[PDB]
Design an enzyme around this catalytic site. Structure first.
Site, mmCIF file in Angstrom:
data_model
loop_
_atom_site.group_PDB
_atom_site.id
_atom_site.type_symbol
_atom_site.label_atom_id
_atom_site.label_comp_id
_atom_site.label_asym_id
_atom_site.label_seq_id
_atom_site.Cartn_x
_atom_site.Cartn_y
_atom_site.Cartn_z
ATOM 1 N N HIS A 75 -1.631 -11.224 -2.996
ATOM 2 C CA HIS A 75 -1.445 -10.079 -1.820
ATOM 3 C C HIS A 75 -2.676 -9.268 -1.576
ATOM 4 O O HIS A 75 -3.591 -8.722 -0.745
ATOM 5 C CB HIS A 75 -0.092 -9.275 -1.950
ATOM 6 C CG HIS A 75 -0.089 -8.264 -0.841
ATOM 7 N ND1 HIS A 75 0.442 -8.229 0.524
ATOM 8 C CD2 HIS A 75 -0.405 -6.849 -1.157
ATOM 9 C CE1 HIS A 75 0.534 -7.097 1.140
ATOM 10 N NE2 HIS A 75 -0.196 -6.171 0.186
ATOM 11 N N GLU A 76 -3.014 -8.773 -2.745
ATOM 12 C CA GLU A 76 -4.154 -7.567 -2.941
ATOM 13 C C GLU A 76 -5.573 -8.286 -3.046
ATOM 14 O O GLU A 76 -6.678 -7.813 -2.464
ATOM 15 C CB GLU A 76 -4.088 -6.687 -4.203
ATOM 16 C CG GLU A 76 -2.577 -5.938 -4.281
ATOM 17 C CD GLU A 76 -2.727 -4.788 -3.175
ATOM 18 O OE1 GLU A 76 -3.703 -4.390 -2.757
ATOM 19 O OE2 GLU A 76 -1.735 -4.558 -2.809
ATOM 20 N N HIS A 79 -6.072 -8.365 0.785
ATOM 21 C CA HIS A 79 -6.480 -6.953 0.876
ATOM 22 C C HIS A 79 -8.089 -7.351 0.862
ATOM 23 O O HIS A 79 -8.648 -6.956 1.727
ATOM 24 C CB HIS A 79 -6.223 -5.962 0.056
ATOM 25 C CG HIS A 79 -4.772 -5.093 0.171
ATOM 26 N ND1 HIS A 79 -4.655 -4.156 1.395
ATOM 27 C CD2 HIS A 79 -3.555 -5.330 0.153
ATOM 28 C CE1 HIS A 79 -3.801 -3.664 1.482
ATOM 29 N NE2 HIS A 79 -2.823 -4.444 0.748
ATOM 30 N N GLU A 106 -0.271 -5.035 6.048
ATOM 31 C CA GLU A 106 0.431 -5.529 4.859
ATOM 32 C C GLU A 106 1.052 -6.990 5.281
ATOM 33 O O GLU A 106 1.166 -7.751 4.463
ATOM 34 C CB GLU A 106 1.528 -4.503 4.629
ATOM 35 C CG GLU A 106 0.676 -3.356 4.045
ATOM 36 C CD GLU A 106 0.181 -3.334 2.635
ATOM 37 O OE1 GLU A 106 -0.829 -3.949 2.256
ATOM 38 O OE2 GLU A 106 0.961 -2.912 1.663
#
Ligand SMILES: [Zn+2]
Length: 243
Positions: A75-76, A79, A106
């Site tokens: 996920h990051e 990002h 997100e």
């Protein structure tokens, strides 16, 4: 088509790049792809993981269990990837802004992690070998090493025919659920599951079953379908295939 829908499509591709330059998708692999970035695991309280872009550094909570640690990372990264793109990151301030823009983000990092852990090619590879079956799901999740629910949604998005996928645990009760393509018969969580239903037979008989039956719609109405169950440590995964 819509913004988000095309936006989603792009964030899918970027993953495809990042990790197409990788030797598979185990945790440590995803780390080595980090092109000169600080990556640190410590205790962050209730925080899973945050990405400070100016110190080019990812933080993952050392406390939480491994699976989410792995997810959080993907996920990051997503990002990271994103901010790396201006043509996209720009498109976003063009139809979105404010908390809106944040909530949207997100969801993409989420969409991101998705792809980045479960390649469009590992899924089709499985669909090809095991078909759209409780079994398939059971593998992808294992093979991908992701959450029953993560697979669930991944597996479905890439399925041709009308078919429902469902995780199940004892109280039974549907936990999560997802449906392919253009099936708009949905199967909620909470939905209880009869002991006569093939799915059940397969749990305290830890026995992979496969036979016809129906979707145990909580509206009482038994809709017919081909079912394939695959049981495991406390859960059974289940593919209802609508004709
Ligand atoms: Zn995030």
């Amino acid at each position: 088509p819509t913004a988000l829908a095309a936006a989603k499509a792009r964030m899918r591709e970027l993953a495809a790049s990042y990790g197409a330059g990788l030797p598979g998708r185990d945790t440590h692999s995803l780390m080595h792809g980090l092109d000169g970035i600080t990556l640190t695991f410590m205790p962050m309280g209730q925080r899973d993981g945050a990405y400070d872009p100016e110190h080019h550094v990812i933080l993952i909570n050392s406390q939480v269990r491994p699976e989410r640690q792995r997810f959080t990372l993907a996920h990051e990264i997503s990002h990271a990837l994103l901010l790396g793109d201006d043509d996209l990151l720009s498109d976003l301030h063009d139809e979105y802004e404010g908390d809106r823009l944040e909530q949207v983000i997100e969801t993409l990092c989420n969409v991101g992690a998705a792809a980045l852990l479960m390649p469009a090619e590992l899924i089709d590879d499985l669909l090809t070998r095991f078909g759209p079956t409780g079994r398939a799901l059971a593998e992808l999740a294992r093979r991908a090493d992701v959450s029953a629910t993560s697979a669930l949604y991944a597996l479905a998005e890439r399925t041709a025919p009308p078919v429902i996928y469902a995780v199940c645990a004892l109280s039974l009760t549907v936990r999560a659920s997802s449906a392919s393509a253009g099936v708009k018969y949905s199967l909620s969580a909470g939905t209880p599951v009869p002991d006569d239903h093939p799915a059940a037979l397969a749990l305290d008989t830890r026995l992979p079953l496969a036979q016809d039956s129906y979707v145990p719609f909580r509206s009482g109405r038994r809709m017919p379908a081909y079912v394939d169950a695959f049981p495991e440590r406390q859960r059974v995964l289940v593919s209802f295939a609508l004709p």
